[PDB]
């Protein structure tokens, strides 16, 4: 019988099932790396030195954490790619916020102008960004009010930058397909984006003052801090587990290490020390456009989990694998989650979840596979997702410990957002299981809390907390 299939699956998947000792060792490695990063920051400031630390340990310049009692109307601009969003937030106190948003697809906004093109000027791009916010101001009939007294605005600008202060961030290089300004006298690269945005607001008569540029993880922490309610411990860790994976945290010795803010954007997706690398991980990195970078994220985030399932399927099934498994990106993290859900605690014998796996594999890969093969595929999906949760837990545990919040405040609130956590109830519970492995009984003082819209609401909250 081809029960060597089960032996092969065990051989291939065992290295993805991280032992307690392996997770503790990785926690130690990550904590040591974080300390090296603080020392790097103290020496080098705005200059990243990858030989000293794989973690950029960026100064967010955020020091003012909201209480939930702040009140007023605050705006945000979320520019992380072609899907731009303006947000308006009524901060009502008691942790309550009412939001509105306006969306623009940059592919449809130049008319006769490709906004992503090297021939497009900074002014043309920022005119469109400012116009997104202006459309929201006009929806609220607020343009004249804002001429009398400007509203404050936070800006999530999700590109590599050099940030000297909360309201001063210079674009280091374009990513994500953008090349705006490269062939003009009016570049974005090498310029502080805040004066460019301010000039565009002025050209439209818009009374908005950008007081912060904020990373999405920091916005996630701030969204949670405002909305959680005082009846619990402080929010000192922010986590995104979605298409990408990153965290931020409140650093108690920030001043001694040369930080202006207290919140550090770790950029831990690039963590690269003593990773539990498997051949599938090497294959994902080797064909990626960012070889040797984001190696921790490549084991964790939704962009990669489907690819992991696909490559492991090919490794385990060989000539029995379906033809579509040979196609890059043919299987995504939502599909992998269907597989993993069927092997979560208490669900291993659930017929409906297993049936959903059979239906999925027929639809996505045209694979009319037998019972033994179906069980193996479920095990592959489970192994990939459970490793993502375990590694996320390592990062959370190390940051929780570094905040000292358990010692100083008796507990900690960890803000979490991102599709892996939001779409899969069991994912956070797996994270908590691994956190208990890492932290012991004091995990009962750690509270994972869903936090929404760090890139919009969170940036508006950032500027509201400055008052
Ligand atoms: O969006 C989540 C996450 O994605 C990547 O890791 C980016 O490098 C980070 O800035 C981060 O915040």
Coordinates of C-alpha atoms and ligand atoms in Angstrom, one line a residue:
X1 CA 0.0 0.0 0.0
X2 CA 1.0 3.6 -0.6
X3 CA 1.2 4.3 3.1
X4 CA 4.8 5.5 2.3
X5 CA 2.8 8.6 1.4
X6 CA 2.1 9.1 5.1
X7 CA 5.8 8.4 5.9
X8 CA 6.9 11.0 3.3
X9 CA 4.4 13.5 4.7
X10 CA 5.8 13.0 8.2
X11 CA 9.4 13.4 7.0
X12 CA 8.6 16.6 5.2
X13 CA 6.2 18.2 7.8
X14 CA 8.0 17.3 11.0
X15 CA 10.4 20.2 10.6
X16 CA 7.5 22.7 10.4
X17 CA 6.1 21.4 13.8
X18 CA 8.3 23.5 16.1
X19 CA 9.1 21.9 19.4
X20 CA 8.9 23.7 22.7
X21 CA 12.7 23.8 22.9
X22 CA 12.9 25.2 19.4
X23 CA 10.4 27.9 20.2
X24 CA 12.2 28.9 23.4
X25 CA 15.5 29.0 21.5
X26 CA 14.0 31.2 18.8
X27 CA 12.6 33.5 21.5
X28 CA 16.0 33.9 23.0
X29 CA 17.5 34.6 19.6
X30 CA 14.9 37.2 18.8
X31 CA 15.3 38.9 22.2
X32 CA 19.0 39.1 21.7
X33 CA 18.5 40.5 18.2
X34 CA 16.1 43.2 19.6
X35 CA 18.8 44.3 22.1
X36 CA 21.4 44.5 19.3
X37 CA 18.9 46.7 17.4
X38 CA 18.5 49.1 20.3
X39 CA 22.3 49.4 20.4
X40 CA 22.4 49.9 16.7
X41 CA 19.9 52.7 17.0
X42 CA 21.9 54.4 19.7
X43 CA 25.0 54.3 17.5
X44 CA 23.6 54.9 14.1
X45 CA 20.2 56.6 14.5
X46 CA 18.5 57.0 11.1
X47 CA 21.1 54.7 9.4
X48 CA 20.2 51.0 9.3
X49 CA 23.2 48.7 9.6
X50 CA 22.0 45.2 8.6
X51 CA 25.3 43.7 9.7
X52 CA 24.5 44.9 13.2
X53 CA 20.8 44.0 13.2
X54 CA 18.2 42.5 10.9
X55 CA 15.5 44.6 12.7
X56 CA 15.4 48.2 11.6
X57 CA 14.0 49.2 15.0
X58 CA 12.6 52.4 13.6
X59 CA 11.7 55.4 15.7
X60 CA 8.0 56.0 15.1
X61 CA 8.4 59.4 17.0
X62 CA 5.1 58.5 18.7
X63 CA 5.0 59.3 22.4
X64 CA 1.4 60.3 23.2
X65 CA -0.9 57.3 23.7
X66 CA -4.6 58.1 23.6
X67 CA -6.8 57.4 26.6
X68 CA -10.2 57.1 24.8
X69 CA -11.4 60.4 26.2
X70 CA -10.2 62.7 23.4
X71 CA -12.9 64.4 21.3
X72 CA -13.0 66.1 18.0
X73 CA -13.0 65.6 14.2
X74 CA -9.7 64.3 12.8
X75 CA -8.7 63.1 9.3
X76 CA -6.3 60.6 7.9
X77 CA -4.8 59.8 4.5
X78 CA -3.9 56.2 3.8
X79 CA -1.6 55.8 0.8
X80 CA 0.0 52.3 0.6
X81 CA -0.3 51.6 -3.0
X82 CA -2.9 52.2 -5.8
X83 CA -5.9 52.0 -3.4
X84 CA -5.8 55.3 -1.7
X85 CA -8.3 56.2 1.1
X86 CA -9.2 59.3 3.0
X87 CA -10.8 58.9 6.4
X88 CA -12.7 61.3 8.7
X89 CA -13.1 60.3 12.3
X90 CA -15.5 61.7 14.9
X91 CA -13.8 60.9 18.2
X92 CA -16.8 60.9 20.6
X93 CA -15.1 60.0 23.9
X94 CA -15.7 56.8 25.9
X95 CA -13.6 55.0 23.3
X96 CA -16.2 55.5 20.5
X97 CA -15.4 56.7 17.0
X98 CA -17.7 57.3 14.0
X99 CA -15.9 57.1 10.7
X100 CA -16.4 58.0 7.0
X101 CA -14.1 57.2 4.1
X102 CA -13.5 58.1 0.5
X103 CA -11.7 55.7 -1.8
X104 CA -9.7 56.4 -5.0
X105 CA -8.1 53.9 -7.4
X106 CA -5.0 55.6 -8.6
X107 CA -5.3 53.6 -11.9
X108 CA -8.5 55.6 -12.6
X109 CA -7.4 59.1 -11.4
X110 CA -4.9 60.6 -13.8
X111 CA -7.3 60.6 -16.8
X112 CA -4.6 61.3 -19.4
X113 CA -1.8 60.8 -16.8
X114 CA -0.3 57.6 -15.3
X115 CA 0.2 58.7 -11.7
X116 CA 2.7 55.9 -11.2
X117 CA 4.9 56.9 -14.2
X118 CA 8.4 58.4 -14.1
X119 CA 7.1 61.3 -16.2
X120 CA 4.5 62.3 -13.5
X121 CA 5.5 65.0 -11.0
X122 CA 5.3 64.9 -7.3
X123 CA 2.8 67.8 -7.5
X124 CA 0.4 65.8 -9.8
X125 CA 0.4 62.7 -7.5
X126 CA 0.0 64.8 -4.3
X127 CA -2.8 66.8 -6.0
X128 CA -4.7 63.5 -6.3
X129 CA -4.0 62.5 -2.7
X130 CA -5.1 65.9 -1.4
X131 CA -8.2 65.6 -3.7
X132 CA -9.2 62.4 -2.0
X133 CA -9.2 64.1 1.4
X134 CA -10.9 67.1 -0.2
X135 CA -13.8 65.0 -1.5
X136 CA -14.4 63.8 2.0
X137 CA -14.3 67.4 3.3
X138 CA -16.8 68.4 0.7
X139 CA -19.1 65.5 1.5
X140 CA -19.3 67.0 5.0
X141 CA -19.7 70.6 3.8
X142 CA -16.7 71.5 6.0
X143 CA -14.4 73.4 3.6
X144 CA -15.3 76.8 5.0
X145 CA -15.1 75.6 8.6
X146 CA -11.6 74.3 8.0
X147 CA -10.6 77.6 6.4
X148 CA -11.5 79.2 9.8
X149 CA -9.7 76.5 11.9
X150 CA -7.7 73.7 10.2
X151 CA -8.3 70.1 11.1
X152 CA -5.4 67.8 12.0
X153 CA -4.5 64.9 9.8
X154 CA -2.4 61.7 10.1
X155 CA -0.8 60.2 7.1
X156 CA -0.1 56.5 6.6
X157 CA 2.5 56.4 3.8
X158 CA 3.5 52.7 3.5
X159 CA 6.8 53.0 1.6
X160 CA 10.4 52.9 2.8
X161 CA 11.2 56.2 4.4
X162 CA 13.6 58.0 6.7
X163 CA 11.7 59.7 9.5
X164 CA 13.4 62.4 11.6
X165 CA 10.3 63.6 13.5
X166 CA 6.6 62.7 13.7
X167 CA 5.8 65.1 10.9
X168 CA 8.9 64.7 8.8
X169 CA 9.3 61.6 6.6
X170 CA 11.5 61.4 3.5
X171 CA 10.8 58.8 0.8
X172 CA 13.8 56.6 0.5
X173 CA 12.8 54.7 -2.6
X174 CA 9.6 53.7 -4.4
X175 CA 8.2 50.2 -4.2
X176 CA 5.0 48.4 -5.3
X177 CA 5.3 49.5 -8.9
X178 CA 5.6 53.2 -8.4
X179 CA 8.1 55.3 -10.3
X180 CA 6.5 58.8 -9.8
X181 CA 8.8 61.8 -10.4
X182 CA 12.0 59.9 -11.5
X183 CA 12.1 61.7 -14.8
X184 CA 11.1 65.2 -13.6
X185 CA 12.4 68.3 -11.7
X186 CA 9.8 67.5 -9.1
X187 CA 10.7 64.2 -7.3
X188 CA 9.1 62.4 -4.4
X189 CA 12.2 60.3 -3.7
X190 CA 14.5 62.1 -1.4
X191 CA 11.9 64.6 -0.4
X192 CA 9.9 65.1 2.9
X193 CA 6.4 64.0 1.9
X194 CA 4.7 66.3 4.5
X195 CA 5.6 69.6 2.7
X196 CA 4.5 68.0 -0.6
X197 CA 1.1 67.1 0.9
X198 CA 0.8 70.5 2.6
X199 CA 1.4 72.3 -0.8
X200 CA -1.3 70.1 -2.4
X201 CA -3.7 71.0 0.4
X202 CA -2.9 74.7 -0.1
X203 CA -3.5 74.4 -3.9
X204 CA -7.0 73.2 -3.1
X205 CA -7.8 75.6 -0.2
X206 CA -8.0 72.7 2.2
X207 CA -7.5 73.5 5.9
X208 CA -5.8 70.3 6.9
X209 CA -2.5 70.1 8.8
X210 CA -0.5 66.9 8.6
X211 CA 1.0 66.4 12.1
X212 CA 2.1 62.7 11.8
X213 CA 3.3 60.1 9.4
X214 CA 2.6 56.7 10.9
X215 CA 3.3 53.0 10.2
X216 CA 0.3 50.7 10.1
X217 CA 1.4 48.7 13.1
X218 CA 1.7 51.9 15.2
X219 CA -1.7 53.0 14.0
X220 CA -3.0 49.6 15.1
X221 CA -1.7 50.1 18.6
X222 CA -3.2 53.6 18.7
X223 CA -6.6 52.4 17.4
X224 CA -6.7 49.8 20.2
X225 CA -5.5 52.2 22.8
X226 CA -8.4 54.6 22.0
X227 CA -11.2 52.1 21.6
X228 CA -10.4 49.4 24.3
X229 CA -11.9 51.1 27.3
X230 CA -9.9 51.9 30.5
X231 CA -11.0 48.8 32.4
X232 CA -7.9 46.9 31.2
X233 CA -4.2 47.0 30.9
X234 CA -2.3 49.4 28.6
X235 CA -1.8 48.7 24.9
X236 CA 1.9 48.6 24.4
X237 CA 2.3 46.1 21.5
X238 CA 0.7 46.4 18.0
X239 CA 0.7 43.5 15.6
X240 CA -0.3 43.0 11.9
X241 CA -0.7 39.4 10.7
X242 CA -2.1 39.9 7.2
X243 CA -0.6 40.1 3.7
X244 CA 2.6 41.1 5.6
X245 CA 3.7 40.6 9.2
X246 CA 5.2 43.3 11.5
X247 CA 5.0 44.5 15.1
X248 CA 5.6 47.6 17.1
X249 CA 6.0 48.1 20.9
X250 CA 6.5 50.6 23.6
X251 CA 10.1 50.7 24.6
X252 CA 10.7 51.6 28.3
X253 CA 14.3 52.7 27.8
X254 CA 13.6 54.6 24.5
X255 CA 15.3 57.8 25.6
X256 CA 18.6 56.2 26.6
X257 CA 18.8 54.5 23.2
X258 CA 18.3 57.7 21.3
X259 CA 14.6 57.5 20.4
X260 CA 12.4 60.6 20.2
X261 CA 9.2 58.5 20.4
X262 CA 8.5 55.7 22.7
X263 CA 7.0 53.3 20.2
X264 CA 9.5 51.3 18.1
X265 CA 8.4 49.9 14.7
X266 CA 10.5 46.7 14.8
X267 CA 10.2 45.7 11.1
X268 CA 10.4 42.2 12.3
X269 CA 9.4 40.7 9.0
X270 CA 13.1 40.9 8.1
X271 CA 14.2 38.9 11.2
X272 CA 16.7 36.4 9.9
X273 CA 18.6 34.7 12.8
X274 CA 18.4 31.0 13.5
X275 CA 15.2 30.6 11.5
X276 CA 13.8 27.1 11.2
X277 CA 14.3 27.1 7.5
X278 CA 12.9 24.2 5.4
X279 CA 13.5 23.5 1.7
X280 CA 10.1 25.1 0.9
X281 CA 11.2 28.3 2.6
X282 CA 14.4 28.3 0.6
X283 CA 12.4 27.8 -2.6
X284 CA 10.1 30.7 -1.8
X285 CA 13.0 33.0 -1.0
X286 CA 15.0 32.0 -4.0
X287 CA 12.3 32.9 -6.5
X288 CA 11.2 36.1 -4.7
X289 CA 12.0 39.6 -5.9
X290 CA 13.5 40.4 -2.5
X291 CA 16.0 37.5 -2.0
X292 CA 17.2 37.2 1.6
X293 CA 14.8 39.9 2.9
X294 CA 11.6 39.5 4.9
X295 CA 12.6 35.9 5.7
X296 CA 10.5 35.8 8.9
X297 CA 7.5 37.3 7.2
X298 CA 7.9 34.7 4.4
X299 CA 7.2 32.0 7.0
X300 CA 4.2 33.8 8.6
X301 CA 2.2 36.1 6.4
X302 CA -0.8 35.5 4.1
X303 CA 1.2 36.4 1.0
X304 CA 3.2 33.2 1.4
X305 CA 1.2 30.6 3.3
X306 CA -0.5 29.3 0.1
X307 CA 2.8 29.0 -1.7
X308 CA 4.1 27.0 1.2
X309 CA 1.2 24.6 1.0
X310 CA 1.7 24.3 -2.8
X311 CA 5.5 23.6 -2.6
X312 CA 5.0 21.1 0.2
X313 CA 2.3 19.3 -1.8
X314 CA 4.7 18.9 -4.7
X315 CA 7.4 17.7 -2.3
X316 CA 5.2 15.1 -0.6
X317 CA 3.0 13.9 -3.5
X318 CA 5.6 13.8 -6.4
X319 CA 4.1 12.5 -9.6
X320 CA 0.7 12.3 -7.8
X321 CA 0.5 16.0 -7.4
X322 CA -2.1 17.8 -9.7
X323 CA -0.9 19.8 -12.7
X324 CA -2.2 23.1 -11.2
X325 CA 0.1 22.7 -8.2
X326 CA 3.0 23.4 -10.6
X327 CA 1.7 26.9 -11.2
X328 CA 3.1 29.7 -9.0
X329 CA 0.5 31.4 -6.8
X330 CA -2.3 28.9 -7.7
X331 CA -3.2 28.4 -4.0
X332 CA -3.8 31.2 -1.5
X333 CA -3.9 31.7 2.2
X334 CA -7.7 31.6 2.3
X335 CA -7.6 28.2 0.7
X336 CA -4.8 27.1 3.0
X337 CA -7.0 28.2 5.9
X338 CA -9.8 25.8 4.8
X339 CA -7.3 23.0 5.1
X340 CA -5.9 24.1 8.5
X341 CA -9.4 24.7 10.0
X342 CA -10.2 21.0 9.6
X343 CA -7.4 20.0 12.0
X344 CA -7.8 22.6 14.7
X345 CA -8.4 21.3 18.3
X346 CA -11.7 19.5 18.6
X347 CA -12.3 19.7 14.8
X348 CA -10.1 16.8 13.6
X349 CA -13.1 14.5 13.1
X350 CA -15.6 17.1 11.9
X351 CA -17.1 15.9 8.6
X352 CA -18.2 19.3 7.3
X353 CA -14.8 20.9 7.6
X354 CA -13.1 17.9 5.8
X355 CA -15.8 18.0 3.1
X356 CA -15.0 21.7 2.5
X357 CA -11.4 20.6 1.9
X358 CA -12.4 18.0 -0.7
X359 CA -14.6 20.5 -2.5
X360 CA -11.8 23.1 -2.4
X361 CA -9.2 20.8 -3.9
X362 CA -11.4 19.8 -6.7
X363 CA -12.3 23.4 -7.5
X364 CA -8.8 25.0 -7.1
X365 CA -6.6 22.3 -8.5
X366 CA -9.0 20.0 -10.4
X367 CA -7.9 17.2 -8.1
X368 CA -10.2 14.2 -7.5
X369 CA -8.0 12.9 -4.7
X370 CA -8.7 9.9 -2.4
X371 CA -9.2 9.8 1.4
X372 CA -5.5 9.2 2.3
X373 CA -4.4 12.1 0.0
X374 CA -7.1 14.4 1.5
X375 CA -5.9 13.7 5.0
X376 CA -2.3 14.5 4.0
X377 CA -3.4 17.8 2.4
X378 CA -5.2 18.8 5.6
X379 CA -2.1 18.0 7.5
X380 CA 0.0 20.2 5.2
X381 CA -2.3 23.1 5.6
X382 CA -2.4 22.7 9.3
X383 CA 1.3 22.5 9.6
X384 CA 1.9 25.7 7.6
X385 CA -0.7 27.7 9.5
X386 CA 0.3 26.4 12.9
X387 CA 3.9 27.4 12.3
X388 CA 2.8 30.9 11.3
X389 CA 0.9 31.1 14.6
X390 CA 3.9 29.8 16.6
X391 CA 6.3 32.2 15.0
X392 CA 3.9 35.1 15.5
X393 CA 3.7 34.1 19.2
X394 CA 7.5 34.2 19.4
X395 CA 7.5 37.8 18.2
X396 CA 4.6 38.8 20.5
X397 CA 6.1 37.1 23.6
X398 CA 9.5 38.9 23.1
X399 CA 7.9 42.3 22.7
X400 CA 5.5 41.8 25.6
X401 CA 8.5 41.0 27.8
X402 CA 10.4 44.0 26.5
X403 CA 7.6 46.4 27.3
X404 CA 7.8 45.4 31.0
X405 CA 4.0 46.0 31.0
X406 CA 3.3 42.8 33.0
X407 CA 5.7 44.0 35.7
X408 CA 4.7 47.7 35.8
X409 CA 1.0 47.5 35.1
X410 CA 0.0 43.9 35.9
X411 CA -1.1 43.0 32.4
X412 CA -0.8 44.0 28.7
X413 CA -3.2 44.5 25.8
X414 CA -1.8 43.4 22.5
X415 CA -3.5 45.1 19.5
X416 CA -3.9 42.7 16.5
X417 CA -5.1 43.2 13.0
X418 CA -4.7 41.6 9.6
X419 CA -6.5 39.0 7.5
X420 CA -4.9 35.9 9.2
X421 CA -6.2 37.0 12.6
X422 CA -9.5 38.6 11.5
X423 CA -10.7 35.8 9.2
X424 CA -9.7 32.8 11.3
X425 CA -11.0 32.7 14.9
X426 CA -8.7 29.7 15.6
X427 CA -5.5 31.5 14.6
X428 CA -5.5 33.8 17.6
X429 CA -6.3 30.8 19.8
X430 CA -3.3 29.0 18.4
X431 CA -1.2 32.1 19.0
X432 CA -2.4 32.0 22.7
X433 CA -1.5 28.3 23.0
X434 CA 2.1 29.1 21.9
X435 CA 2.2 32.2 24.1
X436 CA 1.4 29.9 27.1
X437 CA 4.3 27.7 26.1
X438 CA 6.6 30.8 26.0
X439 CA 5.3 32.8 28.9
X440 CA 3.9 30.3 31.4
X441 CA 0.9 31.1 33.6
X442 CA 1.4 34.9 33.1
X443 CA -0.3 34.5 29.7
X444 CA -3.5 35.0 31.7
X445 CA -2.4 38.7 32.0
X446 CA -1.9 39.0 28.2
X447 CA -5.0 40.2 26.3
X448 CA -5.1 39.9 22.5
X449 CA -7.5 42.5 21.2
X450 CA -8.7 43.0 17.7
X451 CA -8.0 46.6 16.5
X452 CA -9.4 48.1 13.3
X453 CA -8.1 50.4 10.6
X454 CA -4.7 51.3 12.0
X455 CA -3.8 52.9 8.6
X456 CA -6.8 55.3 8.7
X457 CA -8.5 55.6 12.1
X458 CA -5.2 54.9 13.9
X459 CA -3.4 57.8 12.1
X460 CA -6.3 60.1 13.0
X461 CA -6.0 59.0 16.6
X462 CA -2.3 59.6 16.5
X463 CA -2.8 63.3 15.8
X464 CA -5.7 63.6 18.2
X465 CA -3.5 62.4 21.0
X466 CA -1.1 65.3 20.5
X467 CA -3.5 67.9 21.9
Ligands
LIG1 O1 1.5 45.7 6.6 C1 2.2 45.0 7.6 C2 3.8 45.0 7.5 O2 4.1 44.7 6.1 C3 5.5 44.7 5.9 O3 6.2 43.8 6.8 C4 6.0 46.1 6.0 O4 7.4 46.1 5.8 C5 5.8 46.7 7.4 O5 6.0 48.1 7.4 C6 4.6 46.1 8.1 O6 3.9 47.1 8.9

